[PDB]
C-alpha cells in the first residue's frame, strides 16, 4: 500500500535507516517517494529481463529473485515476491545491502535524479520523530 512520508519515515526510522552510512532520513524518504511513490505493490519493467520491486524498487537481476530474469545473481538472497509486502522490513534489509560504502545511495536512479543535492530533509520535516 501507499504509506505517508511521516508514516514511512517513521518505519524507516524504526528500521535503522536514520543516518545509516551517514545518510539523513530525508534521503530514504525521497527515494521511495520517486521510485515507488510510496507503494509497496510497485512493480516496474526495464529494458531487459529486469523488473524492479517494491517501495525501494529492488532489481530482479542483482538483488532479489523472480525466476524469470536472465543472469539473476540474487545478491540480497531473497525472492522479489517478499518485496511487494506491506512490511518494509524485507526491502529495508536488502536496501541496506546495496548501500555498501557510504556513497551506496547513488544506486537509486530517482534518488540520484531528484533527491541528491536538494533539501531532502523537507521530506521528514513535520513528522513527529
Amino acid at each position, epitope marked *: 500500500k501507499v504509506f505517508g512520508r511521516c508514516e514511512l519515515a517513521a518505519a524507516m526510522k524504526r528500521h535503522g535507516l536514520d543516518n545509516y552510512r551517514g545518510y539523513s532520513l530525508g*534521503n530514504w524518504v525521497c527515494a521511495a517517494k520517486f521510485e515507488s511513490n510510496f507503494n509497496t505493490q510497485a512493480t516496474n519493467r526495464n529494458t531487459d529481463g529486469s523488473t524492479d520491486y517494491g517501495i525501494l524498487q529492488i532489481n530482479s537481476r542483482w538483488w532479489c529473485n523472480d525466476g524469470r530474469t536472465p543472469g539473476s545473481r540474487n545478491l540480497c538472497n531473497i525472492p522479489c515476491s517478499a518485496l511487494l509486502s506491506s512490511d518494509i522490513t524485507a526491502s529495508v534489509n536488502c536496501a541496506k545491502k546495496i548501500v555498501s560504502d557510504g556513497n551506496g545511495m547513488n544506486a537509486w536512479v530517482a534518488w540520484r535524479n531528484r533527491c541528491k543535492g536538494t533539501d531532502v530533509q523537507a521530506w521528514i520535516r513535520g513528522c513527529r520523530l
Partner: antibody, heavy 116, light 108 residues
Framework: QVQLQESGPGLVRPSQTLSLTCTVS????????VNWVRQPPGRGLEWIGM???????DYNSALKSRVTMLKDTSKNQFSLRLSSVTAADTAVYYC??????????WGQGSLVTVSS | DIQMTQSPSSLSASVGDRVTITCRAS??????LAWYQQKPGKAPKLLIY???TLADGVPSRFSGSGSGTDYTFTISSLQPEDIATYYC?????????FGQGTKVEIKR
C-alpha cells in the same frame, strides 16, 4: 580530491559592490551545494547563505536584500556578490561544501576589507 | 529563525580533564546539530554531525549528545592538540546559525 579556493579583492571602497569567487574540484556541482560563511577578524563565524545543488538559494535574513549567489558549471565556480559594502563587511569569506547537512569541505578563506 | 546560544565563551583546563561545551537552540533543531573545531589561522573543521556522529579521523576524546534544544559536546581528555575554538551550527531548515563558539585553552 575535494578542493575549494576563494579568490577576490582584499581592498574595497565602501558603497561599492563586493564580489568574490569560489572555484571547486573533486565533486559534482549538482550533487552538492555550497555555503558562504564569513568571519570578521577576531570575531565569530557568520553564515551568509547557500546555493543548493539544484540551483536554489537561501540567504540569512539580514544580508538578504544584498547578497546574490551564482553557480557556474563552466569554470566550476560559485559566485557571491555582496552589494554596497559598509565597513563591517570587512572579513574573511569562506565557501564550504555542504554534504548532507554538514559543511565537510572548507576553502582556505580570503580576507576582504573595506577602506576609509 | 532558530538562534544558537553557546556557552561558555571560553574555558581553561589542564590536560587530562573533561571539558564540556553546550549549545541551546532557540527552537527544536531535531538532532541536526554540527560541531566544528578551529585553530588560529585556518578554516573550521568538521568534528561531529547529527549530534553524535563523528567525522572521519576525529579522535574518540570527542563526543556529542543532545536532543530537542539542548545539545552538548564533550572532549573527554583535554590534550594540547585540542586548543582551538569550537562552534555549533544547526541544520534544521534555513537559515542556519552558528553558536558563538567557545575558546578552549590550557590552564596555566
Amino acid at each position: 580530491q575535494v578542493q575549494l579556493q576563494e579568490s577576490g579583492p582584499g581592498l574595497v571602497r565602501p558603497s561599492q559592490t563586493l564580489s568574490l569567487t569560489c572555484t571547486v574540484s573533486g565533486f559534482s556541482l549538482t550533487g552538492y551545494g555550497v555555503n558562504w560563511v564569513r568571519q570578521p577578524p577576531g570575531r565569530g563565524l557568520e553564515w551568509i547563505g547557500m546555493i543548493w545543488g539544484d540551483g536554489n538559494t537561501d540567504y540569512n535574513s539580514a544580508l538578504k536584500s544584498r547578497v546574490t549567489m551564482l553557480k557556474d558549471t563552466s569554470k566550476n565556480q560559485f559566485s557571491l556578490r555582496l552589494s554596497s559594502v559598509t565597513a563591517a563587511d570587512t572579513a574573511v569569506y569562506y565557501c564550504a561544501r555542504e554534504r548532507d547537512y554538514r559543511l565537510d569541505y572548507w576553502g582556505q578563506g580570503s580576507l576582504v576589507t573595506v577602506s576609509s | 529563525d532558530i538562534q544558537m546560544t553557546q556557552s561558555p565563551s571560553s574555558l581553561s583546563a589542564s590536560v587530562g580533564d573533561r571539558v564540556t561545551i553546550t549549545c541551546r537552540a532557540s527552537g527544536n533543531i531535531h538532532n541536526y546539530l554540527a560541531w566544528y573545531q578551529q585553530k588560529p589561522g585556518k578554516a573550521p573543521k568538521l568534528l561531529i554531525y547529527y549530534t553524535t556522529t563523528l567525522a572521519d579521523g576525529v579522535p574518540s576524546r570527542f563526543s556529542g549528545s543532545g536532543s530537542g534544544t539542548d545539545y552538548t559536546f564533550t572532549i573527554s581528555s583535554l590534550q594540547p592538540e585540542d586548543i582551538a575554538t569550537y562552534y555549533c551550527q544547526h541544520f534544521w531548515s534555513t537559515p542556519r546559525t552558528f553558536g558563538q563558539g567557545t575558546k578552549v585553552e590550557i590552564k596555566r
